[PDB]
Write a protein that binds this ligand. Structure first.
Ligand SMILES: Nc1ncnc2c1ncn2[C@@H]1O[C@H](COP(=O)(O)O)[C@H]1CO
Ligand SMILES: Nc1ncnc2c1ncn2[C@@H]1O[C@H](COP(=O)(O)O)[C@H]1CO
Ligand SMILES: [Mg+2]
Ligand SMILES: [Mg+2]
Lengths: 191, 191
């Protein structure tokens, strides 16, 4: 099986191609953050919208969200979302999904196929929102480090986030809890 | 709240201090791998030992397993497990846990306290096993890159893993599925 190799190979898939970064980010670092953000968003949404989400399925979907990038590499969203490329790349992503875990024990292979092909629209939406939050957070950290090339990126992502918070109360709450002062300049909790 | 800052600050906590690495590893990369390994181990154990584990609680425990290292830094196990330091460092880790999420909404703060203070012995044990698997995997990748300084590390971790597989059938199955050929020299799944 290639499953464990793929989990570690995600460290070789860089994000933010075409942008200068003070800290290079790989898909594994990004995915760790997205799992944590997805969890927090889920807890806020459950309390706000009076429900219980299947957190096992959500966390697993966040965990493997970007696993197909071990084949596709990470195509930055200004490229991937071009009208010329949007639908072709989604078709490519589907071809990758269908071939990835080709050599597993069937109880395990079905569980992985279940995650990658999850048709739960709400779980898909939470992780998409988490992905946007994480990209915004990275842009905040780069600007904090002094990276002026990320100012316009932070502005674009922050504008979209602001528009999202008008339609999704759990995102507005997340923004109020964590994104108005991010990153923390003084790491008081270390001491 | 410091929660989101801490999630990203884990990228500044290096592992393997005192060892030459071809690839520097941080706690966020390691934690991503441990979440995935914990999931796989859980699925194997459920099928082998005829049970169902609360995977939400397991995945959350793996996700925040090392969060106190944002305060303690990552103390390598040959140091942390010295008889002089073993119990003091565990007491330190407990003091950190008690102070970490000091400024959260109570529904969220209780959920985080619930994770960090989880007294589920089986979940604790799965993640401890996942931690050992991940450390072994890292040592395999370093040796694969040509890092002779990791040969003795790989030998030590592999010896302990082998002894563990004699007592835990789900670990023996994991080893048979993934660890006999790791990492993959030819990344066929990319093509
Ligand atoms: N304004 C921007 N300029 C350049 N790259 C950007 C960007 N906004 C996002 N990215 C990159 O696209 C990735 C996000 O895509 P996903 O949500 O699919 O992970 C980001 C990191 O490469
Ligand atoms: N033989 C060895 N020589 C040096 N560092 C080692 C080691 N074995 C493990 N480490 C490091 O200790 C960490 C593992 O500890 P945890 O399980 O608590 O994460 C490893 C990476 O720093
Ligand atoms: Mg993502
Ligand atoms: Mg760990």
């Amino acid at each position: 099986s290639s499953l464990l190799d793929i989990i570690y190979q995600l460290r070789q898939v860089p994000r933010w191609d075409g942008s200068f970064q003070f800290e290079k980010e790989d898909v594994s670092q990004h995915s760790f953050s997205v799992i944590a953000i997805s969890h927090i968003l889920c807890e806020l949404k459950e309390t706000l919208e009076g429900k219980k989400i299947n957190k096992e399925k959500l966390l697993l979907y966040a965990l493997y969200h970007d696993v197909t990038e071990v084949v596709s590499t990470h195509i930055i969203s200004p490229v991937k979302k071009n009208s010329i490329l949007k639908d072709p790349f989604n078709a490519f992503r589907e071809q990758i999904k269908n071939s990835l875990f080709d050599n597993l024990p069937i109880t395990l292979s079905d569980t992985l196929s279940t995650i990658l092909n999850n048709n739960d629209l709400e779980i898909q939406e939470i992780v998409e929102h988490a992905d946007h939050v994480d990209a915004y957070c990275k842009s905040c950290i780069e600007v904090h480090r002094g990276n002026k090339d990320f100012i316009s990126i932070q502005r674009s992502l922050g504008d979209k986030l602001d528009n999202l918070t008008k339609e999704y109360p759990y995102l507005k709450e997340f923004q109020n809890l964590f994104l108005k002062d991010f990153p923390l300049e003084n790491k008081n909790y270390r001491y």
